[PDB]
């Protein structure tokens, strides 16, 4: 088990729900809203081989790009 394959994990499903926060405002295009359908599923398919949890994983990549964002 790779520790950057586990924290880019984490930050694509924090960033995945920044996305879909976005979404959720009705401020996508379609493009957009395919990139999140279809990366929700790549995600899904990345946890499940990682043995990652997509609601943990999203929860510690919130706290990577906190820290990334105050510098």
Do not use: Y
Not at 38 to 55: A, H, P, V, W
Request: hydrophobic residues 40%; charged residues 30%; aromatic residues 8%.
């Amino acid at each position: 088990m790779d520790s950057n394959t586990m924290s880019s994990f984490q930050v694509d499903c924090f960033l995945w729900h920044i996305r879909k926060r976005f979404a959720d405002n009705g401020l996508g295009d379609a493009p957009f809203l395919d990139r999140l359908r279809r990366d929700q599923k790549s995600l899904k398919g990345r946890g499940n081989t990682l043995g990652l949890d997509i609601e943990t994983a999203t929860l510690v990549g919130k706290q990577i790009v906190e820290w990334i964002l105050k510098e």
